[PDB]
Amino acid sequence: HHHMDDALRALRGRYPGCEWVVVEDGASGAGVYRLRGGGRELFVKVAALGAGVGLLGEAERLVWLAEVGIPVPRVVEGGGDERVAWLVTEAVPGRPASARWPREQRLDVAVALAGLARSLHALDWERCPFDRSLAVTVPQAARAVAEGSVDLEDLDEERKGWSGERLLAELERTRPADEDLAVCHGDLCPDNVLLDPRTCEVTGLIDVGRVGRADRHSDLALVLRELAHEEDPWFGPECSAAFLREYGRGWDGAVSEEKLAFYRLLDEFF
């Protein structure tokens, strides 16, 4: 593209002497980089399209999260518009919950994940400026389908070969009766949580573009879908029990397997 090439070259002039490491590519040079040079490290995200409306919103979310006390790295800048935008932050130290952790630490990561879930869900959602409730997310699911932006070739086994239109039928059919609101991350996967390699303290949350009020099960669903794995990520049934014991401290409910199913299905649309 072009707007993109502009954005990357202006970015590169603003961080001279910084070495660029590709952490995920896509489009032109359109993804995620680690920039490093004595000895500061930044994370740089540049996004292809409305992936870019996403990033402007992420700056706002990140700043608000820092003020309210969730560990998130500090923002350096972000910009652009529909089509191409970007976001620069201080890098978050540590290792992602995603990495293969020493076996004797896996339960601790599980627990730290739950603790971070609990701190996010302890915020009073009426303070939160951002809305990611079913009034927002269900229409986004319909527009993705109608856009053919839904990745139908990598759904979860129970739906291989479903059409977008059949996916959206299932979503509308199963939508929950009620939203038990909390301030949610909205893509709370071990990938987006980094932690200190020694203590398992959470050091930062990343990819907060979907932060907003929503049913807490929107966070539980995705974390538990990932924690169920034993390889890539390196968790499993005991870690999910440990996440659930810790989250329960916590919150006296009431974890609904139907809401999890629903929020796992919602996520297929994004």
Coordinates of C-alpha atoms in Angstrom, one line a residue, residues 94-114 195-202 227 234-236 238-240 242-243:
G94 CA 8.4 -9.9 31.0
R95 CA 7.1 -13.0 29.4
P96 CA 3.6 -13.5 27.9
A97 CA 1.2 -16.1 29.5
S98 CA 1.4 -17.5 25.9
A99 CA 5.0 -18.6 26.2
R100 CA 5.9 -22.1 27.4
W101 CA 6.4 -21.5 31.1
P102 CA 8.4 -23.7 33.5
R103 CA 6.0 -26.4 34.5
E104 CA 6.2 -25.5 38.2
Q105 CA 5.0 -22.0 37.3
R106 CA 2.0 -22.9 35.1
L107 CA -0.5 -22.9 38.0
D108 CA 0.8 -19.6 39.2
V109 CA 0.3 -18.0 35.7
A110 CA -3.2 -19.4 35.7
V111 CA -3.8 -17.7 39.1
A112 CA -2.2 -14.4 38.1
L113 CA -4.5 -14.5 35.0
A114 CA -7.5 -14.8 37.3
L195 CA 4.2 -11.3 33.4
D196 CA 7.4 -11.1 35.4
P197 CA 9.4 -14.4 34.8
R198 CA 10.3 -14.7 38.4
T199 CA 7.2 -13.8 40.4
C200 CA 4.4 -14.3 37.8
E201 CA 3.2 -10.8 38.8
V202 CA 1.3 -9.4 35.8
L227 CA -6.3 -22.4 29.4
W234 CA 0.9 -24.7 28.1
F235 CA -1.9 -24.9 30.5
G236 CA -4.7 -27.5 30.9
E238 CA -5.8 -28.1 36.4
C239 CA -4.8 -24.5 35.4
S240 CA -8.5 -23.9 34.4
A242 CA -6.9 -22.9 39.4
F243 CA -8.0 -19.9 37.4

